[PDB]
From a paper:
PP2A predominantly exists as either a core dimeric complex consisting of the scaffolding A subunit and the catalytic C subunit, or a heterotrimeric holoenzyme that contains the AC core complex and a regulatory/targeting B subunit. In particular, the B56 subfamily of PP2A localizes to the kinetochores/centromeres of unattached chromosomes through the interaction between the B56 subunit and BubR1. The multi-domain pseudokinase BubR1 is a central component of the SAC and promotes chromosome congression at the kinetochore. Here we present the crystal structure of a B56-BubR1 complex, which reveals the molecular basis of PP2A recruitment by BubR1 to the kinetochore.
To provide the structural basis for understanding how PP2A is recruited to the kinetochore through its interaction with BubR1, we determined the crystal structure of human PP2A B56γ1(30–380) in complex with human BubR1(647–720)-3D at 2.35 resolution. Similar to the corresponding B56 structures alone and in the PP2A holoenzyme, B56γ1 in our complex contains seven and half HEAT repeats and forms a solenoid shape. There are two B56γ1-BubR1 complexes in each asymmetric unit, with almost identical structures (r.m.s.d. of 0.277 Å for 2281 non-hydrogen atoms). Although BubR1(647–720)-3D contains 74 residues, we were only able to visualize electron densities for 8 residues in a groove formed between the HEAT repeats 3 and 4. Therefore BubR1 should not affect PP2A enzymatic activity and should not interfere with the PP2A holoenzyme assembly. The carboxyl group of BubR1 Glu674 settles in a positively charged pocket, and its sidechain forms hydrogen bonds with B56 His243 sidechain and the mainchain amine group of B56 Ala236, respectively. Among the three potential BubR1 KARD domain phosphorylation sites (Ser670, Ser676 and Thr680), only Ser670 is within the visible KLS670PIIED segment. It was surprising that the sidechain of Asp670 that mimics the phosphoserine face solvent and does not make significant contact with B56γ1.
Author numbering:
A (entry chain C): 668 to 675
B (entry chain A): 29 to 109, 124 to 375
Write the structure that this text describes.
Amino acid sequence: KLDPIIED
Amino acid sequence: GIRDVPPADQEKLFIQKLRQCCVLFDFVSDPLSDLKWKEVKRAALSEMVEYITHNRNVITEPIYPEVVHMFAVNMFRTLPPEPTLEAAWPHLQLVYEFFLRFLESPDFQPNIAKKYIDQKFVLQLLELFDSEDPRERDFLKTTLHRIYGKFLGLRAYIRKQINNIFYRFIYETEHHNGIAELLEILGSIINGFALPLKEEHKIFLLKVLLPLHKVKSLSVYHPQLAYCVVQFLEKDSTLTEPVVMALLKYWPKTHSPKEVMFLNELEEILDVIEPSEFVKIMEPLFRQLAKCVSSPHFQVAERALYYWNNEYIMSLISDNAAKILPIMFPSLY
């Protein structure tokens, strides 16, 4: 459900 | 609406409503008290939601501190000591809704907002995850996910503070109402990790995520925990041995229906396992599986038997038959 968050 | 007064006057009126909504009402002591004023506040909140949703260039620089102060005054509060619901929900719901639309608006400038949405703000927000109201925890979950995404400068702080919450849960209180929601956020973060994995994250797996398996209320958040663990092994297969061995260490020591969730997690691990990692842990794993097949709990026994119908698991067993068959059938092989 929660979209991935790309590490940065 | 705010939209219906002259454009020159709109910001002023918007600020004026935000300040009115800093008046706090008691929904507990006398629930029939001040219904007219409660409704005035509800309608104002609802109006501000519509205004920022249906207009552009209305979140100006003076709006930011007023929005954040309004959120804080409504939400940052001491929590009381099937579920118990927040009686103030008719207002709090709309404050969460509005703040979320605030964060998601195309007007939203994180370079301005970061002056008010800071470590202290995140600290106080994270305290609210212990709320007994699942609807509050749901809004909190979405809100913190958005903040983590948009504020690069807060990301390390958020990870650290979730870990503080988890450590206190594991090593002191063994009681927290929002572990599942926090693990859900972490799952989305783990999925986005770059390679090779930073040492910070491996430590988090080994020191935080694995010990979460030993807390007595595990069943409430186990699906979310399993997902985090599986994502780590999709990122870096070399973590397989410490993970599986720790899972085997934390496995229930009496026959229990709780083994079903352990069998689920373990099968999901096997679904992404590398053959060379499999051979390292197959002997201890299948010693446990053999006990589960012979469990006096029907659901545990059946659940373990299903491993044989997983084509991939069966290909690994069959390629190592000489070592696994004597473990699964001692009196035969």
